[PDB]
Amino acid sequence: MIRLYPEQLRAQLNEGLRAAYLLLGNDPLLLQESQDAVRQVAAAQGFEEHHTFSIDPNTDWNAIFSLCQAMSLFASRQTLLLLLPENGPNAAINEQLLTLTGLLHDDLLLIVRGNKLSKAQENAAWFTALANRSVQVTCQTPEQAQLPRWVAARAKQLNLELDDAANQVLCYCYEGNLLALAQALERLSLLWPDGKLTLPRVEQAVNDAAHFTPFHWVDALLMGKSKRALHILQQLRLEGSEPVILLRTLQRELLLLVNLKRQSAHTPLRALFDKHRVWQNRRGMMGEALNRLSQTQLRQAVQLLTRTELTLKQDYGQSVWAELEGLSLLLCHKPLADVFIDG
Amino acid sequence: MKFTVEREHLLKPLQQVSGPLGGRPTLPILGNLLLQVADGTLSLTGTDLEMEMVARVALVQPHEPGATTVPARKFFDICRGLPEGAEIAVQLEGERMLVRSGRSRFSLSTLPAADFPNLDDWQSEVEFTLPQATMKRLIEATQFSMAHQDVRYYLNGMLFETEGEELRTVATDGHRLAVCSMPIGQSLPSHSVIVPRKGVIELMRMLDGGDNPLRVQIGSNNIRAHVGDFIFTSKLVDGRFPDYRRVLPKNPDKHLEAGCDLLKQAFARAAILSNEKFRGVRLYVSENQLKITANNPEQEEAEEILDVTYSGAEMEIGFNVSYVLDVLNALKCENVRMMLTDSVSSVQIEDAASQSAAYVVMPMRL
Amino acid sequence: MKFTVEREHLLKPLQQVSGPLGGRPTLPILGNLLLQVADGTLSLTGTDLEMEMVARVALVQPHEPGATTVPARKFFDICRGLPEGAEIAVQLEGERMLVRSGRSRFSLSTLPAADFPNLDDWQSEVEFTLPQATMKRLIEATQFSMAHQDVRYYLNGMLFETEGEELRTVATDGHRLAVCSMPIGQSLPSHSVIVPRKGVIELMRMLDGGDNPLRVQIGSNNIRAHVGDFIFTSKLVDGRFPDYRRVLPKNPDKHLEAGCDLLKQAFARAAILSNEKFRGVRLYVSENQLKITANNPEQEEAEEILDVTYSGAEMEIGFNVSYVLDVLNALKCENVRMMLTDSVSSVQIEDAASQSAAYVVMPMRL
Amino acid sequence: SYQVLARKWRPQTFADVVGQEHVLTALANGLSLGRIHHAYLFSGTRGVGKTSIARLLAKGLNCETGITATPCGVCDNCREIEQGRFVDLIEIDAASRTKVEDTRDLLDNVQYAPARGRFKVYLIDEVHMLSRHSFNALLKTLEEPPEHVKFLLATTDPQKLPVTILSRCLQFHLKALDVEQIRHQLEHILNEEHIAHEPRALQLLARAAEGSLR
Amino acid sequence: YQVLARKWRPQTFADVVGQEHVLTALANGLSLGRIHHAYLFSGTRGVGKTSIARLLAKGLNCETGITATPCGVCDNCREIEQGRFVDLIEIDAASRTKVEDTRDLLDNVQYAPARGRFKVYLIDEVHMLSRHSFNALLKTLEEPPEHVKFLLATTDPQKLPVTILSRCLQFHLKALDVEQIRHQLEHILNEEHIAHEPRALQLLARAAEGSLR
Amino acid sequence: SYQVLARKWRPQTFADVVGQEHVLTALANGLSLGRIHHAYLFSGTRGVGKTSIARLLAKGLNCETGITATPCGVCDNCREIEQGRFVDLIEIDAASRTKVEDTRDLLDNVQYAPARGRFKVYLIDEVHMLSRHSFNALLKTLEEPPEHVKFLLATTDPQKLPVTILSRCLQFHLKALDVEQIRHQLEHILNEEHIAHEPRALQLLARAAEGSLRDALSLTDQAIASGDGQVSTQAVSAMLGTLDDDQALSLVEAMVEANGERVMALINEAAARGIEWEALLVEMLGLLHRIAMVQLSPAALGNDMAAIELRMRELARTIPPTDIQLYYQTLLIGRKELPYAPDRRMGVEMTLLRALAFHPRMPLPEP
DNA sequence: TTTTTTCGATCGTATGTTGTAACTATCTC
DNA sequence: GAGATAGTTACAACATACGATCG
Ligand SMILES: Nc1ncnc2c1ncn2[C@@H]1O[C@H](COP(=O)(O)OP(=O)(O)O)[C@@H](O)[C@H]1O
Ligand SMILES: Nc1ncnc2c1ncn2[C@@H]1O[C@H](COP(=O)(O)OP(=O)(O)O)[C@@H](O)[C@H]1O
Ligand SMILES: Nc1ncnc2c1ncn2[C@@H]1O[C@H](COP(=O)(O)OP(=O)(O)O)[C@@H](O)[C@H]1O
Ligand code: ALF
Ligand code: ALF
Ligand code: ALF
Ligand SMILES: [Mg+2]
Ligand SMILES: [Mg+2]
Ligand SMILES: [Mg+2]
Ligand SMILES: [Zn+2]
Ligand SMILES: [Zn+2]
Ligand SMILES: [Zn+2]
The Å distance, CA of F107 to C1' of H12, is: 30
Mode of pairing for the β-strands spanning C87-93 and B104-109: unpaired
Residues B145 and B258 in one domain: no
Q: What angle do CA E117, E122, E123 make, to 5 degrees?
A: 155
Gaps in chain D (C to N over 2.5 angstroms) fall after: none
| Residue A316 approaches strand H within 7 Å at CB | yes
Residue A39 distance to chain B (closest CA, Å)? 17
Chains contacting C (3+ CB pairs below 8 angstroms) = B, D, E
Residue of E nearest to C300 (CA): E114
Quote the CA–CA distance of B319 and B338 in Å, as a whole number.
14
Residue D169 annotated as part of some ligand binding site: no
Q: Which of D85, D90, D148 lies at the smallest CB-CB distance from C365?
A: D148
Boundary residue ending a domain (B90, B123, B156):
B123
| Residue A215 approaches strand G within 7 Å at CB | yes
User: SS3 for A206?
Assistant: coil
Neighbours of C65 (CB within 10 A): 11
Look up residue E166 and give its amino acid: S
Sheet holding D149-155, edge to edge: D89-93, D120-125, D149-155, D39-44, D170-174
Mode of pairing for the β-strands spanning A134-139 and A20-25: parallel
Quote the CA–CA distance of F94 and F86 in Å, as a whole number.
19
Please classify residue E24 by burial: count the beta carbons closer than 10 Å to its beta carbon, then call 0-12 exposed, 13-18 middle and 19+ buried.
middle
Query: SS3 string of A248-300?
Result: HHHHHHHHHHHHHHHHCCCCCHHHHHHHHCCCHHHHHHHHHHHHHCCCCCCCH
Q: What angle do CA A286, A291, A295 make, to 5 degrees?
A: 110
Determine contact, residues C83/C55, Cβ cutoff 8 Å.
no
Boundary residue ending a domain (C199, C218, C247):
C247
- Nearest Cα to C106, choosing from C86, C85, C89? C89
Query: Going by CATH, does the domain composed of A1-142 fall within 3.40.50.300?
Result: yes
Helices F199-209 & F179-193 angle (0-180, nearest 10): 130
D95 in contact with C at a CB cutoff of 8 Å? no
Residues C253 and C346 in one domain: yes
Entry resolution (Å) = 3.0
Distance separating the N- and C-terminal Cα atoms of chain C: 69
Determine contact, residues A255/A317, Cβ cutoff 8 Å.
no
Phi, psi angles (nearest 5°) of residue B318:
-95, 150
Please classify residue C126 by burial: count the beta carbons closer than 10 Å to its beta carbon, then call 0-12 exposed, 13-18 middle and 19+ buried.
middle
CATH number at residue B56: 3.10.150.10
Residue F141 annotated as part of some ligand binding site: no
Determine contact, residues C293/C305, Cβ cutoff 8 Å.
no
Determine contact, residues A258/A245, Cβ cutoff 8 Å.
no
Please classify residue E47 by burial: count the beta carbons closer than 10 Å to its beta carbon, then call 0-12 exposed, 13-18 middle and 19+ buried.
buried
Mode of pairing for the β-strands spanning A161-162 and D149-155: unpaired
Determine contact, residues E191/E163, Cβ cutoff 8 Å.
no
Determine contact, residues B325/B312, Cβ cutoff 8 Å.
no
Residues B243 and B253 in one domain: no
Q: Which residues pair with B214 in a beta bridge?
A: B130, B227
Ligand 3 atom nearest residue F214's Cα: 12
Please classify residue F131 by burial: count the beta carbons closer than 10 Å to its beta carbon, then call 0-12 exposed, 13-18 middle and 19+ buried.
middle
Quote the CA–CA distance of B331 and B361 in Å, as a whole number.
14
Per-domain residue ranges of chain A: 1-142, 143-213, 214-311
Q: Best residue in F101, F242, F283 to probe E by mutation, most E CBs within 10 Å?
A: F242
Interface of C with E in 294-353 (CB under 8 A): 297-299
How is residue F46 annotated by DSSP? T
Fold match, A1-142 / A143-213? no
How is residue D48 annotated by DSSP? S
Quote the CA–CA distance of E178 and E204 in Å, as a whole number.
9
Report the residue among F128, F156, F213 best suited for mutation to probe ligand 6: largest number of ligand atoms under 8 A from its CB.
Answer: F156
Domain total for chain C?
Answer: 3
Conformation bin of residue B364: beta by default, left when phi > 0, alpha when psi is -120 to 50: beta
Residues B224 and B262 in one domain: no
Determine contact, residues D100/D131, Cβ cutoff 8 Å.
yes
Q: How far is CA F266 from each of CA E175, F228, F251, F257, F352, rounded to the nearest angstrom?
A: 15, 29, 7, 14, 11
Cβ–Cβ of B24/F102 closer than 8 Å?
Answer: yes
How is residue F338 annotated by DSSP? G
Quote the CA–CA distance of F59 and C204 in Å, as a whole number.
67
Q: How far is CA C246 from each of CA A23, A84, C193, C250, C358, rounded to the nearest angstrom?
A: 78, 68, 18, 8, 14
Contacts of F183 (CB under 8 A, 6+ apart): F202, F203, F205, F206
Q: Which residues pair with B132 in a beta bridge?
A: none
Determine contact, residues C180/C357, Cβ cutoff 8 Å.
yes
Residues C169 and C119 in one domain: no
The Å distance, CA of A139 to C1' of G4, is: 21
State which H helix or E strand residue F181 sits in: helix F179-193
E108 in contact with B at a CB cutoff of 8 Å? yes
Contacts of B57 (CB under 8 A, 6+ apart): B5, B9, B10, B13, B41, B42, B43, B44, B229
Q: Is any atom of ligand 1 closer than 6 Å to the C-beta of D8?
A: no
Quote the CA–CA distance of F106 and E83 in Å, as a whole number.
42
Helices (DSSP H) in chain B: which residue ranges? 7-17, 72-81, 132-141, 153-156, 197-206, 260-273, 321-330
Q: What angle do CA C252, C254, C260 make, to 5 degrees?
A: 105
Q: What angle do CA F133, F138, F143 make, to 5 degrees?
A: 130
Residue of A nearest to F35 (CA): A190
| Residue F98 approaches strand G within 7 Å at CB | yes
Phi, psi angles (nearest 5°) of residue F347:
-65, -45
Cβ–Cβ of A62/B360 closer than 8 Å?
Answer: no
Residue B73 annotated as part of some ligand binding site: yes
Look up residue C135 and give its amino acid: M
Query: Going by CATH, does the domain composed of A143-213 fall within 1.10.620.20?
Result: no
E5 in contact with C at a CB cutoff of 8 Å? no
Q: What angle do CA C269, C275, C280 make, to 5 degrees?
A: 75
- Buried-state track B303-342, b at ≥16 Cβ within 10 A, e below 16: ebeeebebeeeeeebbbbbebbbbbbebbeeebbbbbbbe
Boundary residue ending a domain (C63, C93, C123):
C123
Q: Is any atom of ligand 3 closer than 6 Å to the C-beta of F52?
A: yes
Contacts of C27 (CB under 8 A, 6+ apart): none
- Nearest Cα to F123, choosing from F32, F55, F204? F55
Helices (DSSP H) in D62-162: which residue ranges? 76-83, 100-107, 132-143
Quote the CA–CA distance of E37 and E167 in Å, as a whole number.
9
Q: Is any atom of ligand 3 closer than 6 Å to the C-beta of F211?
A: no
Determine contact, residues B305/B289, Cβ cutoff 8 Å.
yes
Mode of pairing for the β-strands spanning E38-42 and E169-172: parallel
Closest-approach nucleotide to residue F132, Cα vs C1': G14
| Residue A149 approaches strand G within 7 Å at CB | no
Please classify residue C58 by burial: count the beta carbons closer than 10 Å to its beta carbon, then call 0-12 exposed, 13-18 middle and 19+ buried.
exposed
Instruction: Give the torsion sign (CA, A42, A46, A49, A51).
Output: negative
Chains contacting F (3+ CB pairs below 8 angstroms) = A, B, E
Distance separating the N- and C-terminal Cα atoms of chain E: 17
C-alpha of residue F246 to centroid of ligand 6, in Å: 25
Q: What share of chain A is helix, strand, coil (3-state, %, to 5)?
A: 55, 10, 35
Interface of F with E in 28-47 (CB under 8 A): 46-47
Quote the CA–CA distance of D192 and D8 in Å, as a whole number.
12
What ranges make up the beta strands (E) of B196-329? 214-219, 222-227, 230-235, 254-259, 281-286, 289-294, 304-306, 309-310, 315-319
Quote the CA–CA distance of E134 and E128 in Å, as a whole number.
10
| Residue A74 approaches strand H within 7 Å at CB | no
Residue E77 annotated as part of some ligand binding site: yes
The fold of the A214-311 domain, in CATH, is Zinc Finger, Delta Prime; domain 3 (1.20.272)
**Would you mind telling me the total number of residues written for chain A in this entry?**
343
| Residue F136 approaches strand G within 7 Å at CB | no
Residues C214 and C285 in one domain: no
Determine contact, residues A170/A181, Cβ cutoff 8 Å.
yes
- Nearest Cα to C202, choosing from C47, C8, C80? C47
Mode of pairing for the β-strands spanning B309-310 and B254-259: antiparallel
E108 in contact with C at a CB cutoff of 8 Å? yes
Phi, psi angles (nearest 5°) of residue D74:
-125, -20
Q: Which residues pair with A3 in a beta bridge?
A: A136
Residue A307 distance to chain F (closest CA, Å)? 15
Instruction: Give the torsion sign (CA, E139, E143, E146, E148).
Output: positive
- Nearest Cα to C42, choosing from C6, C70, C3, C98? C3
Residues C92 and C136 in one domain: no
Contacts of A161 (CB under 8 A, 6+ apart): A195, A196, A197
Report the residue among E163, E164, E165 best suited for mutation to probe ligand 6: largest number of ligand atoms under 8 A from its CB.
Answer: E163
- Nearest Cα to B362, choosing from B247, B239, B244? B247
Ligand 3 atom nearest residue F53's Cα: 18
Residue B310 annotated as part of some ligand binding site: no
Write out the DSSP string of A220-250: HHHHT-HHHHHHHHHHHHHHT--HHHHHHHH
Residues C189 and C143 in one domain: yes
Look up residue A71 and give its amino acid: M
Residues B101 and B11 in one domain: yes
Residue C201: domain span: 124-247
Q: How far is CA C201 from each of CA C196, C206, C279, rounded to the nearest angstrom?
A: 9, 8, 27
